[PDB]
Design a protein around this ligand. Structure first.
Ligand SMILES: NC(=O)c1ccc[n+]([C@@H]2O[C@H](COP(=O)([O-])OP(=O)(O)OC[C@H]3O[C@@H](n4cnc5c(N)ncnc54)[C@H](OP(=O)(O)O)[C@@H]3O)[C@@H](O)[C@H]2O)c1
Ligand SMILES: NC(=O)c1ccc[n+]([C@@H]2O[C@H](COP(=O)([O-])OP(=O)(O)OC[C@H]3O[C@@H](n4cnc5c(N)ncnc54)[C@H](OP(=O)(O)O)[C@@H]3O)[C@@H](O)[C@H]2O)c1
Ligand SMILES: NC(=O)c1ccc[n+]([C@@H]2O[C@H](COP(=O)([O-])OP(=O)(O)OC[C@H]3O[C@@H](n4cnc5c(N)ncnc54)[C@H](OP(=O)(O)O)[C@@H]3O)[C@@H](O)[C@H]2O)c1
Ligand SMILES: NC(=O)c1ccc[n+]([C@@H]2O[C@H](COP(=O)([O-])OP(=O)(O)OC[C@H]3O[C@@H](n4cnc5c(N)ncnc54)[C@H](OP(=O)(O)O)[C@@H]3O)[C@@H](O)[C@H]2O)c1
Ligand SMILES: O=C1c2ccccc2C(=O)N1O
Ligand SMILES: O=C1c2ccccc2C(=O)N1O
Ligand SMILES: O=C1c2ccccc2C(=O)N1O
Ligand SMILES: O=C1c2ccccc2C(=O)N1O
Ligand SMILES: [Mg+2]
Ligand SMILES: [Mg+2]
Ligand SMILES: [Mg+2]
Lengths: 251, 251, 251, 253
């Protein structure tokens, strides 16, 4: 039995890392999937590496581009039918303390990590409510929405915003019987291009004082909890935080 | 396609309500299960409803009886092989505020809800560590381990204890590369005999000021998260809290 | 006897409501205080209502105005000497679900509630670090930085961002021995002009299902926890959340 | 001029003869409260009381917090000395350096009888004795950062402090819904220099590592006393069911 039977998903930033693995396991469990990203070559190769146009397709869309979001839903519904599932995964990092954060860096990171999740959640509610789809919006927070990090100040702001904004949306949808659920996923450190391109990041976060398991995670670790959250298995889960972090926040 | 292929699970209180559904879906995903209960009559047919002696068996056992835990593991192990999965689900309730709680009520509830979880977790670590089994201890807390209830004082105490004790155990297992994960599950109100017997409770907890979804969940809602937590899909999840509560704690 | 002897505090949005009472009790405990606000008429009287130019002054400044923050510190230090204490209290509300929030409303609320706190915290760290001042940055979050509200989506986002960004700042100041602490305050409902102008709000949040105490608080309730956080009494408190909410988030 | 922040209050501080409790007793008296401190060792207890003030403001009572019957005599004794009790600090607690795996059942029951049952006995009796008297009554239950995060080598302690954390919310809610005029809150110290820490070899050094306490040092008993003063005063009349964390940044990372 396919765990995402009948589901049609948008996965922002689905061409690399966590987003790519969410896409991969979404198709594996029966979902039609549109992945987005900014770079077209990367995006088209990523999509075909999972399957053909009958199951998965790439759409060039910056998650911070408000107007492009309506085209994204229209295109996705054209190819596969009504969207049932939105994974707001696109996100960037900035290695600066609050003290050392430039306003340009601040605004740039928030435009993607916060405005883009807002745009996808607001539009996802409008387009998916009251259709009996078992709709599910999965917003990618982080353990950095739960704890602080002295060199990720703007990132911390954005992931904590996503954490609580998601509860507002969850509550509204539940109280209004919209048949739309909203939850946040909080990965610990995961081996991705994001982490690979940060020199010494994996060794640093593999320290026992950081990740008690003594190693960082893999993209599939996050894909599988997103499968649970996209599926009707989680029909009673809303407004909740799902932490897959090697024990990071437990100490 | 069997998400729990090769797993051997103990499920305390697995003859009614949430425990019964956990066993049901554990076997559907390929796991041998031993369920426990104090009443041999109710417990014997409960085992048969899911299947036969090649998948599931009943073992009479009070969760607060420390010596029986050793017999429970021995019994399970020669029946099905080395135990891989422990779901500490057995629990009782008392409808008293802290002020109105008698010491006998206090002690009785904690012997099951706190001592029993301790016995299963402690022995579960001893018997499952260092065997490459992908061991998982799943400790049933509650939303009542996350927020208070004015007339569930003893219950709140037990569920907050389970919440943080599981983190201790998760951290020690991770730091010692024991290959045992420990997580807690936090159901909101769920239609079970425990709830069916408290008169007017389902209606009370279906109010929007309690559960935002306007209804209470079903035992299968808790079964599917335990499936995720018992499987190797969650191998980076330890010391974390998984909340399935219809939005109850999100407001 | 004076619990804030020698302290020099900037209190943004100090002309009404909570900020006014913070300023009041700060001057009462021997702090020198600059309050800010947008309306000069209201602000000059607000300052005069507490004391003369020797203990308190008003500066017209919009917390979203980044360049003005540098002038605001300069003006405060000219008047009273080096700033020891920054209370990022200016904030606004928008009564819209996520689904109904206009992008105009989103950007406007975040410019005050989030950018304003970022500007104040970042400059505060730069201007107060390494000067033996027992410096303290107090960032005004809300219970709405902890739980969601279906009709305050952007507000929830802002208060969640403030909650976790403040931890980042607290950690970096602690690790670098800056002698700057950073904490967040999380009021529940408080009788202020913000609540009074919102028709039916006080009645709604006084419901026992919302505030278990059956009434909302008053500005001095937040003033006194801010005095504690500004004083050297709290020299071991950093990165933490101080909730004064009538029991709102305890259920 | 300023004013005694605990004028008219009457406090019971369990385990108030050493460490955090002693500092809570000391600053409670400084702020105008009348205090009874408890402890198991009368020698330590009687000198503790005398070091803070006379019997007009503070007295010692030998009492084991696990001893339910003694709680009644304790409140009776405090009433006769000072008047109706207004403030209960459930501070007595002990530790056990064992993982969950390595905890003997005897270590388990002993720690919980003090850390959990003792806080239950004091909270329940505090409510019964202080409800409906308009005293501005406040129950302060001593949890820990170890009621918020785990520690691999304090499994029973973690259990006890997580229980205190949530049981206090139950009591806060019932008290508020019933208009008892009794607030209940928990305090969560990070590592604090006390006899409990001093007697654990290498504990202060371990918890001074930046990976544990970002401030690079542990706190002192007055750090906890001053938040308890706030919680006992009518200044916190709108605070109930909440967690007050004074930990040098430990749980912020
Ligand atoms: N890696 C971790 O340790 C970790 C931990 C916790 C949370 N997270 C979160 O999980 C999410 C995935 O992170 P990751 O580690 O997989 O990052 P990654 O390896 O850098 O992948 C980034 C993906 O997002 C796309 N992307 C970047 N900017 C975008 C924009 N403006 N609009 C649309 N798409 C964009 C990228 O494609 P293009 O470059 O072609 O646009 C790429 O497909 C992020 O939200 C991150 O904050 C990551
Ligand atoms: N129902 C809810 O809304 C809800 C919500 C959150 C959390 N929970 C938690 O989830 C767990 C299951 O609750 P439920 O609603 O399924 O309870 P339930 O309907 O009362 O079923 C409890 C099961 O536990 C067994 N049990 C009772 N006392 C026992 C003991 N001393 N030793 C061993 N087994 C015992 C019972 O069998 P016998 O009668 O034969 O002993 C029964 O099989 C509990 O830990 C509860 O605290 C429940
Ligand atoms: N009241 C509650 O129940 C409650 C609960 C939780 C949190 N809070 C938070 O507490 C803080 C104060 O709220 P309140 O209820 O006291 O609000 P209020 O009664 O509306 O007072 C707000 C104060 O901030 C000033 N202000 C508004 N916009 C500003 C800007 N852009 N720059 C500088 N100052 C500005 C106002 O003066 P001008 O209008 O003249 O500028 C006024 O002095 C806010 O951060 C709010 O989010 C309030
Ligand atoms: N120190 C820390 O770093 C830290 C951090 C977080 C929380 N805490 C908590 O803070 C509280 C105080 O700890 P502390 O570090 O100040 O401990 P401490 O220095 O060991 O002092 C403990 C006090 O409690 C008394 N006590 C011990 N067992 C008792 C019992 N059964 N009944 C009554 N009194 C008893 C002791 O007196 P006798 O010796 O006369 O019995 C002593 O007066 C405890 O709840 C602890 O769990 C401590
Ligand atoms: O992007 C990241 C990351 C990179 C490297 C280590 C930890 C983390 C984390 O927690 N998030 O969200
Ligand atoms: O025992 C209970 C209960 C009873 C009635 C409604 C909800 C709940 C819950 O969440 N737990 O744990
Ligand atoms: O501004 C507010 C407010 C107004 C009225 C009721 C509750 C609240 C709250 O929680 N915040 O933050
Ligand atoms: O009792 C203690 C203790 C002792 C030594 C170091 C840390 C801690 C702590 O967090 N609690 O609660
Ligand atoms: Mg902006
Ligand atoms: Mg709540
Ligand atoms: Mg931590």
């Amino acid at each position: 039995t396919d765990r995402l039977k009948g589901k049609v998903a948008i996965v922002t930033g689905g061409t690399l890392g966590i987003g790519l693995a969410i896409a991969d396991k979404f198709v594996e469990e029966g979902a039609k999937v549109v992945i987005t990203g900014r770079h077209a070559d990367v995006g088209e190769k990523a999509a075909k590496s999972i399957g053909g146009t009958d199951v998965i397709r790439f759409v060039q869309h910056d998650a911070s581009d408000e107007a492009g979001w309506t085209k994204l839903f229209d295109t996705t519904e054209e190819a596969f039918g009504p969207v049932t599932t939105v994974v707001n995964n696109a996100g960037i990092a900035v290695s600066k303390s609050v003290e050392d954060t430039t306003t340009e860096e601040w605004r740039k990171l928030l435009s993607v990590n916060l405005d883009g999740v807002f745009f996808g959640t607001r539009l996802g509610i409008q387009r998916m409510k009251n259709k009996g789809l078992g709709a599910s919006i999965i917003n990618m927070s982080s353990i950095e929405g739960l704890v602080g990090d002295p060199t990720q100040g703007a990132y911390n702001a954005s992931k904590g915003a996503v954490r609580i904004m998601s509860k507002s949306a969850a509550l509204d949808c539940a109280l209004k019987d919209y048949d739309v659920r909203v939850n946040t996923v909080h990965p610990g450190p995961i081996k991705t291009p994001l982490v690979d391109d940060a020199e010494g990041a994996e060794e640093f976060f593999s320290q026992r004082t950081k990740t008690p398991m003594g190693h960082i995670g893999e993209p599939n670790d996050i894909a599988w909890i997103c499968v649970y959250l996209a599926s009707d298995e989680s029909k009673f889960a809303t407004g909740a935080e799902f932490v897959v972090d090697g024990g990071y926040t437990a100490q």
